[PDB]
């Protein structure tokens, strides 16, 4: 088993009508636990998970102070990055920041990620060593040289390797029956008739946690397959399906394979 914490901080510059929009979205494994929005009536760190309400008022005030502090930090960073690329003030730009740590079944630290983005493209990222930075362009090298003297790489390393792991293990304890749970997928194969003398077979997988699943179609063993992205049901479970164009009569010749951590053995499915 493996569990990971992820914080998604986004800053969207609004030209003329803002006051840029700042959103913080937190995730533990595949479930949302914290939320922050500058456009909200009362800008404060809100719980999205019911088990997160157990945390005291001192924690929420501390996370709001961090979020409000980051809001003005990204606001200054938006104007700084505007000067780095020498772009017009009339245009709208976005800064994305995702960070967190991944722990094993021990459960101790495996990898720490801390990456930045400007207008949906890579800007600066902290390497796997958690001591060096990788700059995408010449404007990002200015940020790297500024963070080398300031010692940002060593500062973030102190969090990702220690403070991140410490809190991730705490959130797993708070949501013991919500995060550590594993629901097996409800699988069934559906038949769809065609007009070109061929039928479409769909291998369904509904109601499962976590989202990590791999659906494959086998004949005697892949490229001809039509797999869709894992979609959330809304109630707390996920959905995913694979489709193949197969000839009429050979409905039982094609077998589907489901790979999920909730299942003790990989399932074999056929149309009936």
């Amino acid at each position: 088993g493996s569990h990971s914490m992820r914080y998604f901080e986004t800053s969207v510059s609004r030209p003329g009508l803002g006051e840029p929009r700042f959103i913080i979205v937190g995730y533990v494994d595949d479930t949302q636990f914290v939320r922050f929005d500058s456009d909200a009536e009362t800008p404060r760190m809100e719980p999205r998970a019911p088990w997160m309400e157990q945390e005291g008022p001192e924690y929420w005030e501390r996370e709001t102070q961090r979020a409000k502090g980051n809001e003005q930090s990204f606001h200054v960073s938006l104007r700084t990055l505007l000067g780095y690329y020498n772009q017009s003030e009339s245009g709208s730009h976005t800064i994305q920041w995702m960070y967190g740590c991944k722990v094993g079944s021990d459960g101790r630290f495996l990898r720490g990620y801390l990456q930045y983005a400007y207008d949906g493209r890579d800007y600066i990222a902290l390497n796997e060593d958690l001591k060096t930075w990788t700059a995408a362009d010449v404007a990002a090298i200015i940020t790297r040289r500024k963070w080398e003297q300031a010692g940002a790489a060593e500062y973030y390393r102190a969090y990702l390797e220690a403070e991140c792991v410490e809190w991730l293990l705490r959130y797993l304890e708070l949501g013991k029956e919500t995060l550590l749970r594993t629901d097996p997928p409800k699988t069934h194969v559906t038949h769809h008739p065609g007009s070109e003398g061929d039928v479409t077979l769909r291998c369904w997988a509904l109601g499962f946690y976590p989202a990590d699943i791999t659906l494959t179609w086998q004949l005697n063993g892949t490229q001809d397959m039509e797999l869709v992205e894992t979609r959330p049901a809304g109630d707390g479970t996920f959905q995913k399906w694979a489709s193949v164009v197969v000839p009429l009569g050979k409905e039982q010749n094609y077998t589907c394979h489901v790979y999920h951590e909730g299942l003790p053995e990989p399932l074999t499915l056929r149309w009936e």
């Binding site: 901080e9 961090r66 980051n70 990204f74 700084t80 800064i95 960070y99 930045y116 969090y159």
Partner: peptide
């Protein structure tokens, strides 16, 4: 918890 952002 998260972490404080360093100015770009």
């Amino acid at each position: 918890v998260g972490i404080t952002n360093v100015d770009l």
